[PDB]
Amino acid sequence: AVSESQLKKMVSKYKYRDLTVRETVNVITLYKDLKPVLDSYVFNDGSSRELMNLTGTIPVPYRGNTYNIPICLWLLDTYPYNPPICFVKPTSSMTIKTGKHVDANGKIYLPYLHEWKHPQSDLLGLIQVMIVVFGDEPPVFSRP
């Protein structure tokens, strides 16, 4: 958590903040799992900006079981890619056996993403598809 005053203060730099908050509010509102985060990073070789990421865990049942597959998201102010990037975050105990879209970088190489032409696509769906893809095949895996 980071209150609404501090949360905004963190995304106060963002240009599409109002748009970001909206997406988030929904993301969370829809799923009370993805928590808002804020992480800064340099640029080029000196510059630095503030970018917020969405880290959480979604319940992925399998064979009547229950799994916890985490996911991290990246946001931007406007550029380069207006739309945020989706990617799975690997753990230390578990492993990442990639997936149909889950690349080696845990990035979602979905065909709907690359060709995401909002409002056609959205975060809700971006997460939905996963719930399915993952709900069918765990891209995490950890059975050596």
Swiss-Prot record:
Tissue: Heart, brain, placenta, lung, liver, skeletal, kidney and pancreas.
Domain UEV: 1-144
Consequence recorded when altering N44A: Reduces interaction with ubiquitin. No effect on MGRN1-binding
Recorded superkingdom: Eukaryota
PTM summary: Monoubiquitinated at multiple sites by LRSAM1 and by MGRN1. Ubiquitination inactivates it, possibly by regulating its shuttling between an active membrane-bound protein and an inactive soluble form. Ubiquitination by MGRN1 requires the presence of UBE2D1.
Location within or outside the cell: Cytoplasm; Early endosome membrane; Late endosome membrane; Cytoplasm, Cytoskeleton, Microtubule organizing center, Centrosome
Residues recorded with modification N-acetylalanine: A1
Subunit structure: Component of the ESCRT-I complex (endosomal sorting complex required for transport I) which consists of TSG101, VPS28, a VPS37 protein (VPS37A to -D) and MVB12A or MVB12B in a 1:1:1:1 stoichiometry. Interacts with VPS37A, VPS37B and VPS37C. Interacts with DMAP1. Interacts with ubiquitin. Interacts with stathmin, GMCL and AATF. Component of an ESCRT-I complex (endosomal sorting complex required for transport I) which consists of TSG101, VPS28, VPS37A and UBAP1 in a 1:1:1:1 stoichiometry. Interacts with HGS; the interaction mediates the association with the ESCRT-0 complex. (Microbial infection) Interacts with HIV-1 p6.
Family stated for the protein in its record: Belongs to the ubiquitin-conjugating enzyme family. UEV subfamily.
Function of the molecule: Component of the ESCRT-I complex, a regulator of vesicular trafficking process. Binds to ubiquitinated cargo proteins and is required for the sorting of endocytic ubiquitinated cargos into multivesicular bodies (MVBs). Mediates the association between the ESCRT-0 and ESCRT-I complex. Required for completion of cytokinesis; the function requires CEP55. May be involved in cell growth and differentiation. Acts as a negative growth regulator. Involved in the budding of many viruses through an interaction with viral proteins that contain a late-budding motif P-[ST]-A-P.
Domain notes for this protein: The UEV domain is required for the interaction of the complex with ubiquitin. It also mediates the interaction with PTAP/PSAP motifs of HIV-1 P6 protein and human spumaretrovirus Gag protein. The coiled coil domain may interact with stathmin.
Protein name: Tumor susceptibility gene 101 protein
Span covered, complete protein: 2 to 145 of 390
